[PDB]
Scaffold this active site. Structure first.
Site, PDB file in Angstrom:
ATOM      1  N   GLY A  21      20.027  -0.176  -1.160  1.00  0.00           N
ATOM      2  CA  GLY A  21      20.732  -1.415  -1.004  1.00  0.00           C
ATOM      3  C   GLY A  21      20.693  -1.960   0.450  1.00  0.00           C
ATOM      4  O   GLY A  21      20.316  -0.893   1.387  1.00  0.00           O
ATOM      5  N   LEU A  80      34.928  -5.415   7.873  1.00  0.00           N
ATOM      6  CA  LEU A  80      35.606  -4.875   9.118  1.00  0.00           C
ATOM      7  C   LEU A  80      34.622  -5.014  10.194  1.00  0.00           C
ATOM      8  O   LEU A  80      33.192  -5.340  10.166  1.00  0.00           O
ATOM      9  CB  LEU A  80      35.833  -3.464   8.983  1.00  0.00           C
ATOM     10  CG  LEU A  80      37.029  -2.790   8.059  1.00  0.00           C
ATOM     11  CD1 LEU A  80      38.115  -3.796   8.365  1.00  0.00           C
ATOM     12  CD2 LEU A  80      36.431  -3.285   6.696  1.00  0.00           C
ATOM     13  N   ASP A 124      29.737  11.020   0.218  1.00  0.00           N
ATOM     14  CA  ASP A 124      28.556  10.800   1.196  1.00  0.00           C
ATOM     15  C   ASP A 124      29.262  10.267   2.484  1.00  0.00           C
ATOM     16  O   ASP A 124      28.896   9.256   3.076  1.00  0.00           O
ATOM     17  CB  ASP A 124      27.506   9.916   0.725  1.00  0.00           C
ATOM     18  CG  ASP A 124      26.179  10.004   1.637  1.00  0.00           C
ATOM     19  OD1 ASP A 124      26.112  10.921   2.484  1.00  0.00           O
ATOM     20  OD2 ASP A 124      25.702   8.786   1.839  1.00  0.00           O
TER      21      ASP A 124
HETATM   22  C1  LIG Z   1      30.415  -4.756  -0.325  1.00  0.00           C
HETATM   23  C2  LIG Z   1      29.681  -3.766   0.622  1.00  0.00           C
HETATM   24  C3  LIG Z   1      29.782  -2.384   0.725  1.00  0.00           C
HETATM   25  O1  LIG Z   1      29.735  -1.641  -0.411  1.00  0.00           O
HETATM   26  N1  LIG Z   1      29.950  -1.554   1.748  1.00  0.00           N
HETATM   27  C4  LIG Z   1      29.264  -0.285   1.778  1.00  0.00           C
HETATM   28  C5  LIG Z   1      28.034  -0.653   2.451  1.00  0.00           C
HETATM   29  N2  LIG Z   1      28.475  -0.760   4.135  1.00  0.00           N
HETATM   30  C6  LIG Z   1      27.647  -0.245   5.175  1.00  0.00           C
HETATM   31  C7  LIG Z   1      26.564  -1.092   5.573  1.00  0.00           C
HETATM   32  C8  LIG Z   1      29.544  -1.725   4.434  1.00  0.00           C
HETATM   33  C9  LIG Z   1      29.806  -1.991   5.402  1.00  0.00           C
HETATM   34  C10 LIG Z   1      30.983  -2.884   5.599  1.00  0.00           C
HETATM   35  C11 LIG Z   1      31.374  -3.482   6.850  1.00  0.00           C
HETATM   36  O2  LIG Z   1      32.332  -4.014   6.919  1.00  0.00           O
HETATM   37  O3  LIG Z   1      30.368  -3.253   7.824  1.00  0.00           O
HETATM   38  C12 LIG Z   1      30.877  -3.796   9.257  1.00  0.00           C
HETATM   39  C13 LIG Z   1      31.830  -3.280   4.286  1.00  0.00           C
HETATM   40  C14 LIG Z   1      31.363  -3.041   3.104  1.00  0.00           C
HETATM   41  C15 LIG Z   1      30.300  -2.042   3.094  1.00  0.00           C
END
Ligand SMILES: CCC(=O)N1CCN(CC)c2cc(C(=O)OC)ccc21
Length: 295
Positions: A21, A80, A124
């Site tokens: 993704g 965030l 993970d």
């Molecule tokens: C809905 C998106 C999700 O599933 N995830 C996990 C993947 N990542 C890592 C890039 C992620 C980052 C952030 C964030 O706020 O980064 C500043 C918020 C949610 C997610």
């Protein structure tokens, strides 16, 4: 096939990439909300994912909705402003203050205690998927599924940190992981915040395993009953002696080293639980400091 259910979102910038993704900062053209959007190009996943929509915790990134469209799955998450990996690199010359390290470890153990009580594993944990805000919170994100899916992203530059946080039972071929795999990962992250260097920076599966062995000693039936009958165990492993933790994580005080040693027990059945770790003396003086964030 469905269409149009994403027109309300405007991509603002890319913030992450994974094997399966890509993650974007996005603005809801209607709501005005700023969200993080994971885009997976394309069952049991739908039920497993939709179950993550109910695991709501102040230390778990809120999953807002799951949007299936044109053979693409979108996960919509709270946003965030920084992850722990970037914050750690921003503090590499000063170090993160110990009371903030302690706060972060305590909150993530609170997060894991919650998931683990619901028999959810992360699988993970990595600095890159620990997200922090200005008010001193840290949150778990990017829960790993039991059965991965989605077309792998051909542009995915792999990362040096991929294997660094993997528990030894995974590396030795255990079929059924326990919640102890997450405690191992968090212990590795705890040590890295304290020392500003990755604890076990392996670059292959065997390099990862052997870096663990050279530090904690090659495991045998004495410390890990059953280890010699695990799928990938080899009697021909080199026999390294355990190092003392004073040399592995200076300048961590004795309470911290004690807790860390318990998070890194070889035997998953002896490794401390998230709930027991919250009761450890290391946290008797835990507070909630403010990080100094740039943006
Ligand atoms: C809905 C998106 C999700 O599933 N995830 C996990 C993947 N990542 C890592 C890039 C992620 C980052 C952030 C964030 O706020 O980064 C500043 C918020 C949610 C997610």
């Amino acid at each position: 096939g469905p269409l149009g259910s994403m027109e309300n979102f405007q991509k603002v910038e890319k913030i992450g990439e994974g094997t399966y993704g890509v993650v974007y900062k996005a603005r809801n053209k209607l709501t005005g909300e700023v969200v993080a959007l994971k885009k997976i190009r394309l069952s049991t996943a739908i039920r497993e994912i939709s179950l993550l929509k109910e695991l709501n915790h102040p230390n778990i990134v809120k999953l807002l909705d799951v949007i299936h469209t044109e053979n693409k799955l979108y996960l919509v998450c709270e946003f965030l402003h920084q992850d722990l990996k970037k914050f750690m690199d921003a503090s590499a010359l000063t170090g993160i203050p110990l009371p903030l390290i302690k706060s972060y470890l305590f909150q993530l153990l609170q997060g894991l205690a919650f998931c683990h009580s619901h028999r959810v594993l992360h699988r993970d944990l990595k600095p890159q998927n620990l997200l922090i805000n200005t008010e001193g919170a840290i949150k778990l994100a990017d829960f790993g599924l039991a059965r991965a899916f989605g077309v792998p992203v051909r542009t995915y530059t792999h990362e040096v940190v991929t294997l660094w946080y993997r528990a030894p039972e995974i590396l030795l071929g255990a079929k059924y992981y326990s919640t102890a795999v997450d405690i191992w990962s968090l212990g590795c992250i705890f040590a890295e915040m304290v020392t500003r260097r990755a604890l076990f920076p392996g670059d292959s599966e065997i390099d990862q395993l052997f870096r663990i062995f050279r530090t904690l000693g090659t495991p045998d039936e004495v410390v890990w009953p059953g280890v010699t009958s695990m799928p990938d165990y080899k009697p021909s492993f080199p026999k390294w002696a355990r190092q003392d933790f004073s040399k592995v994580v200076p300048p961590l005080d004795e309470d911290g080293r004690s807790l860390l040693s318990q998070m890194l027990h070889y035997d998953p059945n002896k490794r401390i639980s998230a709930k027991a770790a919250l009761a450890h003396p290391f946290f008797q003086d835990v507070t909630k400091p403010v990080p100094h964030l740039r943006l």
